[PDB]
């Protein structure tokens, strides 16, 4: 009963996003976990802990607590959902460490389990995340095939991940210079983003637009970064500005390319500063 209180309190503080309090409460719940019964109430506990750690990008701690929950959840065949989610945490942490090959292995396992258990949304989530790793690994053909499979499911369900999947799909096709097919996913995603009031992807589509689908309207890229930066989305600013910087480097536009490397530096500094 005592562990339960500290446990619930941790989830409670995480809800109001008091991260220090949550982990603080979890730290004692874990001590009073000495008197724990079922292997899966522990697993439930470890999962939550890995999650708050994943939120604070404490990559080492998150992946530790995730694996401990995972190694238990795998057995109990009634807990496929929990198993898949644990694997997402592991793979998300691996993504944060730029271990995209290892993260792909995780997500591939997730897809198998999501399949043999017919969890439709987890199937699309695996496909999407697989496609994202592939994009990072620059295997764009496979990235696209996994992304449309995700798209088929999300379009039916109208889940929020629809926008992000269309965005990633658009970008992947643009990187292969498949500008005509990309423009189709661009208009479709840009529309879904606008009508869902997804201001974040609206700004992100504007970056693709300035990059690929206007006549070189670079101010669109700029204004979109202004929007993102104003929203304190510095990870997005850091990652996207590097992609933009790389692209201009490949074109031989060194001045523009430098401007965006500089911006990524600043965004990184803002992340360390909190
Ligand atoms: Cl094309």
Residue numbers in the entry: 101 to 374
Text lifted from the article:
The large family of Gram-positive quorum-sensing receptors known as the RNPP proteins consists of receptors homologous to the Rap, NprR, PlcR, and PrgX proteins that are regulated by imported oligopeptide autoinducers. Rap proteins are phosphatases and transcriptional anti-activators, and NprR, PlcR, and PrgX proteins are DNA binding transcription factors. Rap proteins and their inhibitory oligopeptides, called Phr peptides, have been most extensively studied in B. subtilis, which encodes 11 Rap proteins on its chromosome and another five on plasmids. Sequence and structural analysis shows that the Rap proteins are repeat proteins consisting of nine HTH TPR or TPR-like folds, which pack together to form a right-handed superhelical TPR domain.
To reveal the structure of a Rap protein alone, we crystallized and determined the 2.44 Å resolution X-ray crystal structure of RapI. While discussed extensively below, it is worthwhile to note here that there are two copies of RapI in the crystallographic asymmetric unit, and while one model is relatively complete, there was in fact insufficient electron density to build helix-turn-helix (HTH) 1 and HTH2 in the second model (see Discussion and Materials and Methods). Similarly, comparing the structure of RapI with the structures of RapH-Spo0F and RapF-ComAC revealed that the RapI 3-helix bundle and linker region have joined the TPR domain; however, it is important to note that RapI and RapJ are not in identical conformations. The RapI structure reflects this scenario, and the ligand-binding groove is in an open conformation. Therefore, we evaluated the ability of RapI to dephosphorylate Spo0F in vitro, and we found that RapI is indeed a Spo0F phosphatase. Furthermore, we determined that the pentapeptide DRVGA and hexapeptide ADRVGA, sequences derived from the pro-PhrI C-terminus, inhibit RapI phosphatase activity in vitro. In the more complete RapI model, where the N-terminal 3-helix bundle and linker region are included, the N-terminal 3-helix bundle, linker region, and C-terminal TPR domain together bury 857 Å2 surface area at their interface. However, consistent with the idea that the structure of RapI depicts one of many transient conformations, we note that the position of the N-terminal 3-helix bundle and linker region in the more complete RapI model is likely influenced by crystal contacts with symmetry-related copies of RapI. More likely is the possibility that the structure of RapI alone depicts one of many transient conformations that the 3-helix bundle and linker region can adopt in the absence of a Phr peptide or target protein. In comparison to the Spo0F and ComAC bound structures, in both the RapI and RapJ-PhrC structures, the N-terminal 3-helix bundle has rotated ∼180° and the linker region helix has rotated ∼135°.
